[PDB]
Design a binder for this molecule. Structure first.
Ligand code: RJS
Length: 167
């Protein structure tokens, strides 16, 4: 028994809610929050910018040090950094950005990173400003992640569409 509230159960291990992931993280303070990162860990917009802004830019400062030491992530890759005021840890995961010509097949690889963590608060990877079909992202999530994932989808219209079309 954990502290997540108001989620709709989709499968044995996948749950969903129409919520802002930043507000959810501030309220729950989960072990792991997932960031929709890019390979440079440049947190300007979407989930990354909003989490980062909520950390008063401490996430970006930590991220720049990580990149200066390790170089960029791979598309489909991840790294674990601090969750600052929002979570114990932040799992920065790079889904393919369709708007940059990245291979959508890498979305499954991106979701595989979630399997290294027992429980996660996460957004829908490659959705919104990353340019991929959100219904597809949810399908890949359900078919790839085996650990307990609590999904926060910002858009009510999209949330309702995701639930109503879910197989
Ligand atoms: O990215 C999120 N949810 S989402 O479903 O995965 C992708 C998505 C987001 C907004 C729109 Br409009 C859309 F069409 C698709 C999301 C969840 N909290 N949060 C907070 C700040 C910014 C973003 C987010």
């Amino acid at each position: 028994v954990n502290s997540f509230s108001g989620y709709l159960k989709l499968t044995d291990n996948v749950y969903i809610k129409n919520a802002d992931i930043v507000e959810e993280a501030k309220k729950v303070k989960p072990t792991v929050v997932v960031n929709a990162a890019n390979v440079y860990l440049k947190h300007g917009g979407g989930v990354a910018g909003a989490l980062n802004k909520a950390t008063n830019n401490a996430m970006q400062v930590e991220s720049d040090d990580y990149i200066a030491t390790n170089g960029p992530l791979k598309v489909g890759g991840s790294c674990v950094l601090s969750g600052h005021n929002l979570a114990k840890h932040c799992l920065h995961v790079v889904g393919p950005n369709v708007n940059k010509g990245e291979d959508i097949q890498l979305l499954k690889s991106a979701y595989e990173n979630f399997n290294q963590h027992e429980v996660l608060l996460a957004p829908l990877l490659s959705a919104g400003i990353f340019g991929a079909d959100p219904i597809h992202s949810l399908r890949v999530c359900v078919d790839t992640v085996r650990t307990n994932v609590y999904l926060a989808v910002f858009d009510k219209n999209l949330y309702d569409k995701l639930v109503s079309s879910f197989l």
